[PDB]
Amino acid sequence: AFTVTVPKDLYVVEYGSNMTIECKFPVEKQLDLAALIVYWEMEDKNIIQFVHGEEDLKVQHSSYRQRARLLKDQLSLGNAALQITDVKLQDAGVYRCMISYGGADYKRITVKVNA
Amino acid sequence: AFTVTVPKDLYVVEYGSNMTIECKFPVEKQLDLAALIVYWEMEDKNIIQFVHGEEDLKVQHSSYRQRARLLKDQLSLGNAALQITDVKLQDAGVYRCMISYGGADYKRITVKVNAPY
Ligand SMILES: N#Cc1cncc(COc2cc(OCc3cccc(-c4ccc5c(c4)OCCO5)c3C(F)F)ccc2CNCCO)c1
């Protein structure tokens, strides 16, 4: 059965720091981009939309522009790593990570910032 | 590009009636049930989780037990029709439908419940 896995449900982090929220999905041998969809939202704000290898900066929410990046390096290891840099207080909430890979699941991640 | 469609984004529904909120997705004349996933939530509550031509009931939230039905009849027309029956004020809110069908999208639908005296 297809199932998205989350190592850490809560992220405690600082203002101005860099965090990498992670989501594991089952990669068999070699990653078929033609089946892979990854989508991170937070409160219905589009943070990453990767569909079959294709992403568009224009569809990213204003809040998250130029700061927030899916790490492609990690995807062949079965890991949608969302990396935000220069973290702000307005970033903080329930992030949702949705993977499709011949089968679909999501998981929620809470993020608290300090200072 | 794969695109889930919503005929109406608001529904005004009577108390004690039945509502059928609809999400349209593109079918290229094919059933292909093993690639179709449909999921409705509302306020983090799982309402339907349809997969391999079968509604998975253990993951479904029991506040929606015996009252939420996905209309399977409608799916070959490219239409996840969620039918809730015996509509209450708690059923007002933002429903989210997630379709995966070689291509993935979601849409929100608002439901306002009215009870004339
Ligand atoms: N504000 C807002 C808002 C408004 N409109 C659309 C969107 C989201 O735009 C997109 C989202 C995309 O990928 C989402 C995605 C990716 C991977 C898996 C799933 C998925 C599906 C089923 C599931 C599941 C997960 O987990 C288990 C249950 O069954 C999903 C989702 F369907 F749930 C891909 C493309 C678009 C672009 N939009 C096309 C034009 O309209 C957001």
Output the DSSP codes for B32-57. Answer: -GGG-EEEEEETTEEEEEEESSSB--
Q: What is the CATH number of the domain that holds B33?
A: 2.60.40.10
CB spacing of A98 vs B104 below 8 angstroms: yes
Residue B101 in any domain: the answer is yes
Method used for this model? X-ray
Closest CA to B6 of B116, B117, B105, B112: B105
Residue A56 in any domain: the answer is yes
Residue B20 in any domain: the answer is yes
Which chain B residues have a beta carbon less than 8 Å from that of A44? 108
Residue A5 in any domain: the answer is no
Number of domains present in the structure of chain B: 1
Residue B5, min C-alpha distance to chain A (Å):
17
Would you say B9 and B108 are in contact if contact means Cβ atoms under 8 Å apart?
yes
Residue B32 in any domain: the answer is yes
Our answer on whether the CB atom of B104 is closer than 6 Å to any ligand 1 atom is yes
Structural domain boundaries, residue B40: 10-114
Give resolution, Å, one decimal. 2.7
Residue B4 in any domain: the answer is no
Residue A2 in any domain: the answer is no
Residue A27 in any domain: the answer is yes
Instruction: Locate the chain B residue with the closest alpha carbon to A36.
Output: B103
Q: Report CA-CA distances (Å) from B56 to A21, A47, B45, B46, B70.
A: 29, 30, 14, 11, 11
Distance CA B84, CA B69 (A): 7
Would you say B80 and B22 are in contact if contact means Cβ atoms under 8 Å apart?
yes
Distance CA A45, CA A51 (A): 17
Residue A44 touches chain B, beta carbons under 8 Å: yes
CB spacing of B37 vs A104 below 8 angstroms: yes
Pocket test for ligand 1, best of A98, A99, A107 (most atoms within 8 A of CB): A98
Q: Report CA-CA distances (Å) from B102 to A4, A104, B28, B50.
A: 18, 11, 11, 15
Would you say A100 and B104 are in contact if contact means Cβ atoms under 8 Å apart?
yes
- Residue closest via CA to ligand 1's atom 29 equals B39
Instruction: Locate the chain B residue with the closest alpha carbon to A52.
Output: B103
